[PDB]
Amino acid sequence: AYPFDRQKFSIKVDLAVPTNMFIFNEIERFQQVVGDQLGEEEWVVTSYSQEITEVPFERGSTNSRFTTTLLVKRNLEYYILRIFVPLFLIISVSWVIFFLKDYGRQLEVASGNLLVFVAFNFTISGDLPRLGYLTVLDRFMIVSFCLTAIVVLISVCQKRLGAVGKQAVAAQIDTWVLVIYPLVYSLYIIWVYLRFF
Amino acid sequence: EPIGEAPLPRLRLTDSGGKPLAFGLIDQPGESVELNYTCDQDICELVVHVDGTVYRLLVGINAPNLREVGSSVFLESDLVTVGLAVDQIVGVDQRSENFSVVGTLKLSWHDPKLGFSPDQCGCTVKSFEDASIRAVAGEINLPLPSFSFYNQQGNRWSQNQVIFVTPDGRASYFERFTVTLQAPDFDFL
C-alpha cells in the first residue's frame, strides 16, 4: 500500500536459560513506555503493547520471552510535495497542448515526457528494497508510461493521415484523445479507493 | 518547629544500620517536637528520619538550654561539585537530528574516608588512571558517584580518566570525551 501503509515494529527480549531455572512472571512499567519526544518526524506512534509468551528450543527446553510492539503510520507531506505535485503538472500541460492543432508538436511534447518519466522511475526506486511485487506508486507510473507511448502513435498516424487530405478523420479523431486522456486516470483512482479506503 | 500553618511531621532517630534507638514525644503546644538520646557505645553514627509520607528542623550537639549556624557544621557531606566545558563542535547532522562535541568534565567532592598519612607513600597526592580506578574502592567499599549522558546515542570515546586524592579527603575527577547527542527541539518552520 506504499506510501499509505502502517507497519509495526517489535522488540523481543529473551532469556538465555531454560524454563526450570528461570522464567518471566509479571510485567511492570516503572516508566512511560513511549517517551514524549523521540525524533523521527516521518513516523508517528499510535499504540503499543507488552506481553509474555513461551517459545520452544532444542528438543525439550523452553525459555521465556517478552515482546514490545509499536504501531506506526507515515506522514504524507513530503510525498505530496516532491512527487504528486510535479507529476500532476507535467501530465496536465501535456493534455492542454492538445488544443493546438499544430501536429508533430503533439509528438514532440509526448516524446519528451517519455524521457522525464524514466527519471521519475529511478528517483522513486532509490529508497525501496529490490522488491518482489508491485506497490501502488509503481502501478501509477506503469499506467502513465504505457498511455503516453500510445499518443505518439496517434500523432504519427495523424501527421501522415493529414498529408493525403483526409483532415476530417484527423480533426474528428483529435477530439477523441481529448476525452480518453482525462477519463482514464479518474478510472484508475477509483480502483485504488476501494482497495485501501 | 514548622514555619507556619504546616502539620507536624513524624521524626525518628535510628542507627546507620537501620535499628532504632529513640523516638520523639510531642507536647501540648504542638508547635515543636522533642527528641533526646545519649550514646554509651564506642562509635555512635546517627541518622535523623523526618517523615511526611517546607518545614524547619533544628539539630544540636551538647546544647543544654538550646532555646534562644554554630561554630562548625554538624552534618556530613555528600555534595558533588560539577563543571563542563566545550572545546570543539565536530559536526552537525540536520537530517538525523544529532550533533557531536569534544569536551571535558570535572567532578569533585569530600569524603572523610580514603584519607592517608603522608608517611605511607612519602608523597602528597595520589593518582589513578584508566581502569585501575575500578580496582580501588571496592576493597574499601565506599560509594562513588556514577554519571550518565542522558541523551547520548551510541558510544562515548573517552580517552583519559584521572582522579587526584589529597590526604584530608578531597578527590577531583577529570575526564575527556567525544560524544554524539540528540537534539529534539529542531524547528524548521
Side-chain angles (χ1 to χ4, degrees), chain A residues 1-87 89-158 161-165 167-173 175-185 187-197, chain B residues 2 4 6-7 9-22 24 29-30 32-52 56-64 69-70 75-129 131-133 135 137-138 140-189:
Chain A
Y2 178 81
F4 300 91
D5 55 274
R6 337 167 50 77
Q7 333 278 12
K8 91 208 283 219
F9 302 153
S10 312
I11 312 159
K12 297 175 163 148
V13 180
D14 195 341
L15 259 191
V17 303
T19 279
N20 63 354
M21 272 185 57
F22 278 120
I23 37 169
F24 281 22
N25 206 48
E26 84 201 12
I27 272 179
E28 181 203 38
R29 312 151 302 273
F30 67 102
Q31 249 188 37
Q32 180 156 164
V33 189
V34 280
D36 40 48
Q37 58 206 1
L38 316 97
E40 194 41 59
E41 322 86 338
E42 198 184 355
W43 300 97
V44 200
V45 194
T46 60
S47 321
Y48 63 73
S49 59
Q50 309 200 310
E51 70 185 55
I52 282 178
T53 46
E54 304 295 14
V55 283
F57 199 91
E58 210 152 331
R59 211 206 68 230
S61 309
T62 59
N63 35 24
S64 276
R65 192 190 276 178
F66 160 82
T67 325
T68 302
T69 314
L70 272 60
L71 316 188
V72 295
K73 43 151 81 172
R74 208 198 302 277
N75 287 329
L76 288 178
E77 207 71 80
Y78 163 98
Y79 288 80
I80 205 149
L81 203 150
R82 315 303 172 181
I83 308 168
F84 292 163
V85 159
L87 268 183
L89 289 193
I90 301 185
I91 290 172
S92 151
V93 291
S94 283
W95 169 71
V96 84
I97 298 194
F98 286 179
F99 290 174
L100 285 205
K101 304 311 190 147
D102 195 9
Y103 278 116
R105 267 250 296 271
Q106 276 208 351
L107 184 147
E108 270 288 86
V109 297
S111 92
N113 285 37
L114 213 56
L115 274 144
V116 172
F117 274 20
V118 311
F120 252 108
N121 230 27
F122 276 149
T123 289
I124 276 154
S125 76
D127 42 347
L128 251 63
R130 298 260 170 80
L131 286 202
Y133 52 84
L134 270 301
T135 50
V136 158
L137 195 34
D138 273 327
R139 286 192 216 288
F140 169 86
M141 281 276 308
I142 285 326
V143 159
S144 298
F145 259 124
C146 294
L147 167 77
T148 190
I150 293 328
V151 67
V152 284
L153 174 44
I154 283 148
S155 298
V156 86
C157 165
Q158 280 169 314
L161 194 129
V164 181
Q167 264 92 336
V169 181
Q172 173 264 298
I173 217 78
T175 62
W176 224 246
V177 200
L178 242 195
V179 309
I180 301 301
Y181 215 81
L183 194 38
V184 159
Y185 280 47
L187 199 160
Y188 157 76
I189 270 172
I190 296 307
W191 187 34
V192 171
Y193 187 115
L194 325 180
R195 259 303 269 167
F196 308 102
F197 305 110
Chain B
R10 187 72 55 195
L11 89 170
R12 174 161 321 290
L13 158 63
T14 89
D15 204 23
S16 62
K19 146 203 190 69
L21 321 174
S32 78
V33 308
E34 229 299 324
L35 162 87
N36 214 57
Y37 155 95
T38 278
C39 193
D40 70 282
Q41 299 86 312
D42 282 357
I43 319 179
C44 328
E45 277 218 297
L46 301 203
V47 172
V48 279
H49 296 62
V50 202
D51 176 15
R56 156 176 284 113
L57 167 84
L58 255 50
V59 283
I61 283 285
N62 281 11
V69 197
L75 302 312
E76 281 305 10
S77 179
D78 62 327
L79 327 167
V80 180
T81 298
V82 86
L84 187 139
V86 174
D87 280 11
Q88 311 180 13
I89 294 187
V90 201
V92 154
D93 216 345
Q94 270 190 131
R95 89 188 64 173
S96 314
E97 282 144 291
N98 56 38
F99 71 105
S100 324
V101 278
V102 182
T104 191
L105 199 63
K106 166 173 185 146
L107 264 56
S108 41
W109 77 100
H110 198 313
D111 207 337
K113 235 193 290 194
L114 61 78
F116 67 102
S117 90
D119 308 339
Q120 318 259 340
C121 75
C123 65
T124 60
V125 282
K126 297 157 69 66
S127 164
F128 318 114
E129 44 100 38
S132 70
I133 323 177
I140 326 294
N141 254 279
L142 62 94
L144 305 206
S146 299
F147 48 77
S148 66
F149 280 71
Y150 173 47
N151 63 326
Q152 162 205 284
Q153 314 168 343
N155 209 30
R156 170 163 101 251
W157 307 97
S158 67
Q159 76 163 311
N160 274 266
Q161 301 136 79
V162 54
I163 164 168
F164 298 105
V165 182
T166 306
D168 72 38
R170 312 222 181 221
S172 321
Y173 175 74
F174 295 77
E175 160 162 323
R176 173 153 258 276
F177 59 84
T178 285
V179 83
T180 286
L181 311 145
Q182 180 217 63
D185 301 342
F186 260 127
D187 218 298
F188 291 120
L189 189 44

Coordinates of all heavy atoms in Angstrom, one line a residue, chain A residues 3 55 81-82 129 160 190, unseen atoms left out:
Chain A
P3 N 2.6 4.7 -0.7 CA 3.1 5.1 0.7 C 1.9 5.4 1.6 O 1.9 6.4 2.3 CB 3.8 6.4 0.3 CG 3.0 7.0 -0.8 CD 2.4 5.8 -1.6
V55 N 8.4 -19.9 24.0 CA 8.9 -20.4 22.7 C 9.7 -21.6 22.9 O 10.4 -21.7 23.9 CB 9.6 -19.3 21.9 CG1 8.6 -18.3 21.4 CG2 10.6 -18.6 22.8
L81 N 4.5 16.6 -2.0 CA 5.1 17.8 -2.5 C 6.2 17.6 -3.5 O 6.4 18.4 -4.3 CB 5.6 18.6 -1.3 CG 5.8 20.1 -1.4 CD1 5.7 20.7 0.0 CD2 7.2 20.4 -1.9
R82 N 7.0 16.5 -3.3 CA 8.1 16.2 -4.3 C 7.6 15.4 -5.5 O 8.3 15.5 -6.5 CB 9.2 15.5 -3.5 CG 9.5 16.1 -2.2 CD 9.9 17.5 -2.3 NE 10.1 18.2 -1.0 CZ 10.4 19.4 -0.8 NH1 10.6 20.2 -1.8 NH2 10.5 19.9 0.4
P129 N 13.6 -1.4 -1.2 CA 14.3 -2.6 -1.5 C 14.0 -3.1 -2.9 O 13.0 -2.7 -3.5 CB 13.9 -3.6 -0.4 CG 13.3 -2.8 0.6 CD 12.7 -1.6 0.0
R160 N 0.8 11.7 -40.9 CA 0.7 11.1 -42.2 C -0.7 11.2 -42.8 O -0.9 11.4 -44.0 CB 1.2 9.7 -42.2
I190 N -10.4 5.4 -8.9 CA -11.5 4.7 -8.3 C -11.1 3.3 -7.9 O -11.5 2.8 -6.8 CB -12.7 4.7 -9.3 CG1 -13.2 6.2 -9.5 CG2 -13.8 3.9 -8.7 CD1 -13.5 6.9 -8.2

